[PDB]
Design an enzyme around this catalytic site. Sequence first.
Site, short mmCIF file in Angstrom:
data_model
loop_
_atom_site.label_atom_id
_atom_site.label_comp_id
_atom_site.label_asym_id
_atom_site.label_seq_id
_atom_site.Cartn_x
_atom_site.Cartn_y
_atom_site.Cartn_z
N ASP B 25 24.55 31.12 -25.88
CA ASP B 25 25.79 29.92 -26.95
C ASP B 25 26.39 29.50 -26.01
O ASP B 25 27.05 28.96 -26.55
CB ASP B 25 25.94 31.32 -28.02
CG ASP B 25 24.42 31.54 -28.24
OD1 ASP B 25 23.07 31.49 -28.12
OD2 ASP B 25 24.66 32.96 -28.96
N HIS B 98 18.22 20.93 -14.23
CA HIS B 98 16.54 20.17 -15.20
C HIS B 98 17.37 18.38 -15.98
O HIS B 98 18.23 18.76 -16.87
CB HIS B 98 15.57 20.64 -15.72
CG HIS B 98 14.77 21.33 -14.44
ND1 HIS B 98 13.93 20.03 -13.18
CD2 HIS B 98 14.76 22.29 -13.90
CE1 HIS B 98 13.82 21.18 -13.22
NE2 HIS B 98 13.40 22.57 -12.63
N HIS B 121 17.30 19.33 -8.10
CA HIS B 121 17.65 20.32 -9.98
C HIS B 121 18.69 21.52 -9.41
O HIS B 121 19.65 21.55 -10.38
CB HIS B 121 16.06 20.53 -10.91
CG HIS B 121 14.92 21.09 -10.01
ND1 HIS B 121 14.24 21.00 -9.60
CD2 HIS B 121 15.80 22.37 -10.05
CE1 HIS B 121 13.68 21.46 -8.84
NE2 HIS B 121 14.25 22.99 -8.95
N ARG B 333 -1.35 4.23 -26.88
CA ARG B 333 -2.51 5.18 -26.05
C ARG B 333 -2.48 3.67 -25.22
O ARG B 333 -3.64 3.70 -24.44
CB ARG B 333 -3.17 5.93 -26.39
CG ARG B 333 -4.22 6.54 -25.17
CD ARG B 333 -2.89 7.33 -25.63
NE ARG B 333 -3.59 8.89 -24.27
CZ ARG B 333 -3.22 9.87 -24.62
NH1 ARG B 333 -1.60 10.45 -24.80
NH2 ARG B 333 -3.60 10.88 -23.40
#
EC number: 3.1.5.-
Lengths: 481, 481, 481, 481
Positions: B25, B98, B121, B333
Site C-alpha cells: 500500500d 520495470h 530492471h 493498425r
Amino acid sequence: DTMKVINDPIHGHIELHPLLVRIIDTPQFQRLRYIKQLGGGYYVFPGASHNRFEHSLGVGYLAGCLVHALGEKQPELQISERDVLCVQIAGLCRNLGHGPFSHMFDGRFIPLARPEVKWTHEQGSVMMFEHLINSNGIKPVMEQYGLIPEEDICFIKEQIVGPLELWPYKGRPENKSFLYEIVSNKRNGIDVDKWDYFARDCHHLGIQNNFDYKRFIKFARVCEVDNELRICARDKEVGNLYDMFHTRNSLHRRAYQHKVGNIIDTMITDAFLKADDYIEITGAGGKKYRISTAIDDMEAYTKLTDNIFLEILYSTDPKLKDAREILKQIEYRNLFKYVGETQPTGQIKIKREDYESLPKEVASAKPKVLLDVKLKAEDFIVDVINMDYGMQEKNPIDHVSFYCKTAPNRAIRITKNQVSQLLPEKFAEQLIRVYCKKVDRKSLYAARQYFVQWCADRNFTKPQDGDVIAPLITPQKKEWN
Amino acid sequence: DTMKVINDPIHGHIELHPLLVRIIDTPQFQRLRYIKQLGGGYYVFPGASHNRFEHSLGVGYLAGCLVHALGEKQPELQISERDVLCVQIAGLCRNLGHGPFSHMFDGRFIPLARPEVKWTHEQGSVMMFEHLINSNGIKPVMEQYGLIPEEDICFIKEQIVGPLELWPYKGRPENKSFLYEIVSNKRNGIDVDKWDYFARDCHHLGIQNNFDYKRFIKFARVCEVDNELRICARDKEVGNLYDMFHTRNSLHRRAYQHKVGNIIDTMITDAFLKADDYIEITGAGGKKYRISTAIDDMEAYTKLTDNIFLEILYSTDPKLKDAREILKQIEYRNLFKYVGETQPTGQIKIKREDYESLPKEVASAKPKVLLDVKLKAEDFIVDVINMDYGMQEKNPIDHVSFYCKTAPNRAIRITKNQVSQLLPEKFAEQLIRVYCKKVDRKSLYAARQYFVQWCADRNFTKPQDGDVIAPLITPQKKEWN
Amino acid sequence: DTMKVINDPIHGHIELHPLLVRIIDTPQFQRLRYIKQLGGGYYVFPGASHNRFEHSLGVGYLAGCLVHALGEKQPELQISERDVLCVQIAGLCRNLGHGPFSHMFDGRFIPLARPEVKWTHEQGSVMMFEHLINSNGIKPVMEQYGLIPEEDICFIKEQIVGPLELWPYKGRPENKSFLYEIVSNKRNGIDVDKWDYFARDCHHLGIQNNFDYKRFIKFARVCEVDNELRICARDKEVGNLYDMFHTRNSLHRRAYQHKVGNIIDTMITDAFLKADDYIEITGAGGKKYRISTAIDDMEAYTKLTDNIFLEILYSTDPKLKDAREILKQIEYRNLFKYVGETQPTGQIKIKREDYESLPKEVASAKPKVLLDVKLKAEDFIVDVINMDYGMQEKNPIDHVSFYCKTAPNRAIRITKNQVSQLLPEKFAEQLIRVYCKKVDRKSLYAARQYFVQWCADRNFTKPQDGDVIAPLITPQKKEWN
Amino acid sequence: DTMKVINDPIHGHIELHPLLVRIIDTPQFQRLRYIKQLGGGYYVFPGASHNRFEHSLGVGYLAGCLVHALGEKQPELQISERDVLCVQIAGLCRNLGHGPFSHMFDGRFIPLARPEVKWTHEQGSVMMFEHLINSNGIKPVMEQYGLIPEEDICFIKEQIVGPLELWPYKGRPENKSFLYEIVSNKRNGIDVDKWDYFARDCHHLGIQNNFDYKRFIKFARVCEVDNELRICARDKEVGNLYDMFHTRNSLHRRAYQHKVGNIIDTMITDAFLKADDYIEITGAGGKKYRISTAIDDMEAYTKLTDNIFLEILYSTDPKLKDAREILKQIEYRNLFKYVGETQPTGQIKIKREDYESLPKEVASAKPKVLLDVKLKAEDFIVDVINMDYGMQEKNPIDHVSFYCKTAPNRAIRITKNQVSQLLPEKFAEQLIRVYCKKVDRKSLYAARQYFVQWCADRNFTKPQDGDVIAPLITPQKKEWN
Ligand SMILES: Nc1ncnc2c1ncn2[C@H]1C[C@H](O)[C@@H](COP(=O)(O)OP(=O)(O)OP(=O)(O)O)O1
Ligand SMILES: Nc1ncnc2c1ncn2[C@H]1C[C@H](O)[C@@H](COP(=O)(O)OP(=O)(O)OP(=O)(O)O)O1
Ligand SMILES: Nc1ncnc2c1ncn2[C@H]1C[C@H](O)[C@@H](COP(=O)(O)OP(=O)(O)OP(=O)(O)O)O1
Ligand SMILES: Nc1ncnc2c1ncn2[C@H]1C[C@H](O)[C@@H](COP(=O)(O)OP(=O)(O)OP(=O)(O)O)O1
Ligand SMILES: [Mg+2]
Ligand SMILES: [Mg+2]
Ligand code: NA
Ligand code: NA
C-alpha cells in the site's frame, strides 16, 4: 481478404470478418482497451485487469454463434449472412458508450455531476457508433460486403438501445423479431452480453462460473409466441435458466457490489468531481470540454478513459490538489471505513429521492453510549443498492417461452410452482451500506453506534455483527431478541 | 495483526502478512498496476491485459510457499519466520524496477535513448525498493515484526540483484545459501518468478502451461554441494526440468517474440523517442525529468507508467505531432509490414554492434528483377532475437543438483546423455525478422525481393515462404534446391 | 429425427446423428465402457479411471469437426454429408478392437500367449465393426441416411486399418484422398485420435495439455501435393506441430511408460498367462474360447473386457490359485522392484528377438563385490521401450505439407533447419528398465550391483543414480568420468 | 519414513502418511476402485467414469487440510498429530461401506431385497473398517506411529457413523468436539466429503462448480458455542454457505437425479433382484452369500462390486436369463420411457410406505378419452424423490455459528432475514417421476393421459409439457389456468 483469427482466453480462436476488423481498427473502438470492465473492482480482485475491448470481442463472437446456430437448425427463418454480420456488429459495438471505470461513470459520477441530464451507456454507444461510422468511412465498406447502410445502421442501433421511437422497429420486420433478443434482450434479460461477462469476469476474478451458454445454444429454437417470433428454450432447461440469474446475482454480491470496491468507486468519483472544473479535453472544432461534458461531444469522449485517473494522480497544478489528494489516499489504502449493512423490513422500500437525506438521518440518531467524538452528516456515506433479477420485482422466467420435445414448434409457458418450492419468493431487494469518512478508531466506534441505532429507529434488519459492534444498542430492540 | 486474504485467479486465496500489506500500500508498489506484464503483446493477445502488480503478488506468494516447504521437510536448516518474510518481500518487490510496457522499456527504449548508461530492471527494482522503504517509514514496521533492517534490507536487495560487490553475500551466511536460489536464481534460472509468469501469462494469453511447480516443490530438497547448501531436485524429475525450459522457449516463440507484438513494441519505442524532448515528469525537489531520465530519480520514475502512451496519444502540442502520429497509426493498425524471417547457418553469429548495419545490407542487395520502386536503408527494420535456455549457450541442467531416493542427502550431477537422445543439441540460436516501413503493395513486393536476395547472399536459411514471395530469386541458390 | 446431445467433459455438448446412436447402442460398442484407456496406469494415476468408450465418442466428434471445417472453407472439395458420416463412423469405431487394459493386451499379453499370430487393435477394430454391423442390422439404417453400404463399409474399414491390400484405396477416389488423413493418419501421424487422447488423458491424469487442436483446425487447408489432395498446415504453425509430438513424447515419459505402471501391466499379464488354460469364454455356437483365443471369435471377444481381472481375483477354483495370487500381491502393493534405467549408446540398437536373453545377461554380469545372496536370470525383468515420434527414426514434419498466407492453394515443404536449432537431432531411442522379483533389501542391493555392472559391460549409459546405488562399480568405467 | 506422493486431478500432489498407505494397500480399500461414484450416472454422463477409491483419497486429503489449518491458526486447540492422523483415516475410510453402483445399492436394492433390515453405507463403512484393521494387522502399525488403537479406532468409527451408543462420544472429549464436524458433520452438513465430490463430480460430469472450499478453510475458526468448541464461519461468508447447499441441490437436479440415470439404476436393481437367488459369493469359512446377504459377511462383501453387473451380463446359466435380459435391454438402450414429472401441493407429503400404492393409483385414473390400449399397475414405475438442504425441512444455516472480524473468538447466530429476501422460503420438496414399461407409441400416449389425469385428481402440479402431451385433460383443471 482477411478473416482474421483472434485468440481469446475465454472463447479460444475467434474468426473476425474483414468488416468487423475495419470497425475494430479505429480510435473509437480501440478506446475500450483503456476502460476497465469492473472499474474499482480491480482494486479488490487483482485478477480483474480486463478491459471493455476484449469483452466487446466476446460479445460480438457469441452474438454470431447464436444467430448462426438458429439459422442452421431452422433454415425456414431465412437468416442471411447480412443478418449475421449486423448482429455481430451490434454485439461488438454495444459497449462503445462506456466511460472511465465503466459503471462508476454512468452509475455514480454523471448522476452527481449532471443531475439534470439522463445519460446511459446505451445512448453513448449509439452516439459513439455513429461517430465511428462517420469518422472512418465505414459505410462504403458495409456496401462492399452486402450491407445496406441506411437499414442496417438503424438495425444495429436498435439492437443496442431499442426502438428509435404496432411493430416499433424499422431495421428489420416482425418475421425477424427474434434477432432483437440476442444482443440486448429487453424482454427477459437473456442475452449474449451476460454470457460473455459471466465467463470472462469469472476467469479473471477467480470465481468459477456454473452457467453453460453452449448448452443453451444447443437447446435454443425460434417459435411463434403471440404472433411474434421469439427465441425459446427447451422446457426441461428451465432450472438452468433460474440458475443463470442466480449466477448473475452471486456475481453482483461477491464482486460487483463488493463493499470496498464500491467505496473505491465512490472515492474515484469524488476525485473526478473535484477535478471537473480543471481538466480540459479537446473536442470537435478545438472546443474544450470537461469530464462531465465530454459526453456532449464524441470527439472529446473518445479521449475520455481510465487515463483521467492518472492525469489527476500525476498532476502538479495546485488547482488539482484536492482531487489528487483523494487518489493519493486510495494508493495508501486510506479508504472510507465500512460501518455495516442493513435492509428494510416487509413491503417498505426506499425511494431514490430520499437518498440524500440518509446521512443526516444516521447523524441524527441518538445512541445511549458514551462517545468522545460526535459525527456530522457529511462524515457518513449511505449507499443504497437495488438487487433484482434484471426486471425489478418481476420473475424473468415468466417472460420466457419454452418448447417440448414432442412438439418443437409449439411455444409454452412455465410458472414458478411448476418448477421448485426451493426458488426465491421475491425477485428484488435493497441493501443499505453505511461508511464513515473519518477513519480513526474512535470515530469508527462512534459510527457503529449511530448506525445500529438508526437501524433500530427505522426498523431495518439487525446488522449481522450488531451484537459485537454495538452491544449496548442491540438489546433495546424487541424484534432482535 | 491478522493476515489480509487476497483472491488471485492463478493461486486462489493467498495470505498476506501485515508487513507485506504495508509495503504493497504505497505509491511505489501500486505503480505496478499501470504497467502491462507483456507490453505490446496485449495488442496481439487481447487476454493479456494483466499488469506487473498481480504478477508481483504471485511471485511473493510462491517465494513463501517454497521457503515454507523446505523448512517443514528439513527443520535442520533452521529457516526462521524472519527468513520467510525476507524471502516473501524480495519476491514481492523484484518487479518494482520495470518501466512502461515492461521489456520494451529496458529491452528497446533505454538502450537507444541512453546508450552510454547501463540499466536493468533488477537495478531499478533495488533503487525503487530503497525509495519505497525510505519514503514510507517501513524500517520501524520491519522491526515491529522482528526484522533487523540493516541486515534484512541488504538480504532483500541481494536476492533481487545479486552480490552488491569467496562468499560474496552479506545479508545471510553460507549456511543459508539456498535462500538465494528462490527469487532470482543466477546459478540455473529455476526460480519462483518463472513459475508465476508461466501460469499467469498462459491463463491470460489463452495458451496452456505444461509445467507443474507444485510437483517440483514436493520433490525439492536442500543438500550440500561443494561445501554449499543448495536446492536440489529429485533425480527422476530431470525430464520435468528440461520441459520447464522448453515451456519457457515455447512461450517466447508463440507470444513474447510474436512478430507483430515486436513491431508494435518497436513503434511504441519510436514514439517515445520522438516524445522524449517534450514530455516532462516532475521528480524530487520539483526538478523536471524526461522519459529517458526518469530512471535517474525514483520520485519521477514512480510516475512513469503505461500512461505515457496515452499522454502522447491525447496530446495537442505540435511538438508531439510526430510521436502522436505513430501511435495513431498503431490504432488504425497501419503497422510496419512483416517481410520475413531467417536464421544464420553454423559458426556465424551476429554481434550486437552490427545490428545498425543490417538495414543498409538489405537495401544493398541486388535482386535480378525489374523493380518499379527501389527502397532505402531507413525503409527497413531488422530485429535480431536471441533465443536461449537462460544461460546463453549453456545447458542449465548442467548447473542443477539432484538427489536419489536411496540417499536423499547426497547431491549428484546428471549429464545430457544420461537423460534422452531426443533433447536439443544446442541451447542458443538467433532469429532475424525483417520489416518494411513502406506499406504499399509495390513496396512490399520489392522488400521481399531484397530480403530473399540478402538471405541468399548471406547464406542464411531459406525463408519458409521464399518460393512464393520471391519465385525469381529462390532458384539461384543451389543449397535451397 | 433430431440429434442426441451428449455432454462430454473434454468437448462439452456433442451432437450425435441418429445413425451414430444406432451404432453406439450395441453390445459391441458398449463393451468399450469396460476397458480402461490407460490400463495399469490407473494403479499409478488415480484420476485415470476413463474408458475407451468416452475416448471413442471424442474421436468421432473431432473427426466430424475437422471434415466439416474443411468443407465449409473449401466447397470445391465436394465433401458430402455422406462423407462426413463415414468419417465420423470411422472415428467412432477405430477403438473397437482394444482388449482388456488396452495396450497391455496387444502390446504384452497376445505376443507372449500367441507368438505365432500377428494381431493389432486395428485388425480387431475392423473385425468387431463387421460383427457390429451384421449382428445389429445396421446396413438398412445406413441406406436410410443415404450411405451406400458396400462402398462406405469399405471406406470406413480403410480409414481404420489402411489399404485392404497406383491408388490403393477402394472406398473413395484420389480426389477425396485428404479424407484418409483424418482418423488414422499413416503419412505423418497427425490425426484426431491423438487430439482426443491428449486432452482426455491430461484431464484425468492431472497433467496439463499444451497442444491446441482447435487452432490447428482453424489453420488447416487441403492442397494438391504431387497430384494428390492432402491436408496442409499453415507455414508458421510448424512450431506448434513439433510441439504436438513433443507433448506426445512427454505423455509417454511421464505417464504411459511410468515404471510402476509398466510393472503392474507386466504382473497383470503374468496373471492372465497363468489363468489362460482355465478361464472359458462362450462364443458363437456355444463354443468355448480362452483369453488368448477370444480374438478368433468376435462374439467371444465382445465379452472380453477388464472384467477378466476381477473374475480371476474373485475366483475360488484351485486351478486359478497362481493367477489369483499374483493379483492379490498387486492389491497388497507387493510389486516387483525397480532397479534402474539405462539406454544404448551410438550404433547399438536392441532387436526384439534378443529381449528373452536380457535377464540372463544381467544375472551373468560379474560385479567385483562379495555378495551374500546371488540372483538368477528368472529373478530379473528387463523391459525395453521404444520411444519415437511415431514414424520410427523419421521426422514426421518432413512428411507434412504447408501453405503460406500469400498463396493459400500452393503446398510447400519445410525442413528442420528452416525452423529451429533447438529441435531434437534424433527421433527415436530405446529405454531399458530393469526390475527384480526378489523384494528384500539384500537382494535389491545385489540387483543394483549386477545391473550397473551389466550397463558398464554393454557400454550402456550410466544410470542416473549409479554413483549412489553402486559406488564400487561406477569408477571402473572411463566414459562415465 | 517419508510420505508417498499421489497426483490427483482435483487436488494435485497429495502427501500420504505411511500409515495411510498401509490402510490403502489392502483388498478392503482397493475394492473401491471397482465401484463407480455415480453408478448409473455413467450411462448418461460419459465423463463420470470415476470410482469411490479416488474420491476416498480426496476426502482423506481434505480432512487433513482442514484439521491442519485450524491447528495452525489456533495452537490453543491443542490439535496433535495423532488427532490429524485419526481425522485423515476417518476421511479416507468413510466410503468403505458402499456397494455396487453406490447409491443404487443402499438407496434402491437393499430396501427392496431386505425390507426388514436397516442398512446404511455408514454402518457398512464401520464394519468394513473393522474387517480391514483385523485382516491386515493394522493395530500394531497404528501404535508404531503413536496412535492408541482402542481410543482411536473408536474415534474413527464415531466420525464415520456417529455416537457408538451429556456428551455422547468416547473417542475424544468435549474440548475436541470440533473434530467431529470435519468428516461427516451431523450438526449442519458442512463436511469435507461434500467438498471433494462437488469438485470431483463436476470435473468428470462436465458441469462447473461454484463453491470455493479453500476460501471457506481460510475463513474457518473454532469458537465456544454453548460450552462446546465448534467450527465457525466468518459472518460475511454466510452467502457462500447458502450457495454451497444450492450447489449440492443443483448437482442432484442436473446429475444425480437425472431421470434417465435413475431409470437405468432402477433397471439394474431389477436385474439384481432377479439374479439374487442364483449369484453366489464365497465369504468367511467358505460359506456362500447372495447379493442381498453379502452385507452380513465382510469377506463376501469385499468381493461385491460393479463386477456383479458383468457377471450377470456375461452369464450362460439359464437361471440368470431374466436378469441377463434386462441388462441386455440396457445395452440396446431399450429403456423404460419417461412419462413426466409432478410435485405435491401444500400440506400433502408422500410417506415411504405408500410408494407401492402409487402405480396402482396411476392405472386407476379415468381419463375421458377413447384409448385402444389400457395399461395395468405393473406397466408403471413411480419414483418419488426427496429433495432438501440435508436437514429435512430445516435451514442448515440456522445450525451454523459465525464470528465477526472485530471479535474473532465470539460466536454468533444469523437468521434468514438478516441475509436476503432472495433465498428459499422452504428447504424440502418432493419430485414424482412416472415411467412406463411399455415402450410403443400407443402405450406411451395412453400413459401420458393416465399420468396427467392422476396429477389433476391428486391436485399435484401441472406437468411442464401437460398441454402438449394431454391437450384434452389439462383444460378440466381450474388451478392450471
Ligand atoms: N502459437 C500460438 N498459440 C496460440 N495463440 C497464438 C499462437 N500464435 C499466435 N497466437 C494468437 C495471437 C493472436 O491472438 C492470434 C493470431 O495470431 P497469428 O496467427 O500469429 O496471426 P498474425 O496476424 O500475426 O498472422 P498472419 O497475419 O501471418 O496470419 O493467435
Ligand atoms: N465470495 C467471494 N469469493 C471469492 N472471492 C471473494 C469473495 N468475496 C470477496 N472475494 C475476494 C476479494 C479479495 O481478493 C479477497 C478478500 O475479500 P474479502 O474477504 O471481501 O475482504 P474484505 O477486506 O472486504 O473483508 P474484511 O476486511 O471484512 O475481512 O476475496
Ligand atoms: N443441466 C445439465 N447440464 C449439463 N449437462 C447435462 C444437464 N442435464 C443433462 N446433461 C447431460 C447428460 C447428457 O450427457 C446430455 C443430455 O442430457 P439431457 O438433455 O437431459 O438428455 P435426455 O436424453 O435426457 O433429454 P430428452 O431425451 O428429454 O431431450 O447432457
Ligand atoms: N512427471 C509427472 N508429472 C505429474 N505427475 C506424475 C509424474 N510422474 C509421476 N506422476 C504421478 C503418478 C503418481 O500419481 C505420482 C507419483 O509418481 P512417481 O513420482 O513417479 O512415484 P514413484 O513411486 O513411481 O517414485 P519413487 O517411488 O521412485 O519415488 O505422480
Ligand atoms: Mg476489470
Ligand atoms: Mg500484459
Ligand atoms: Na489472448
Ligand atoms: Na462414477
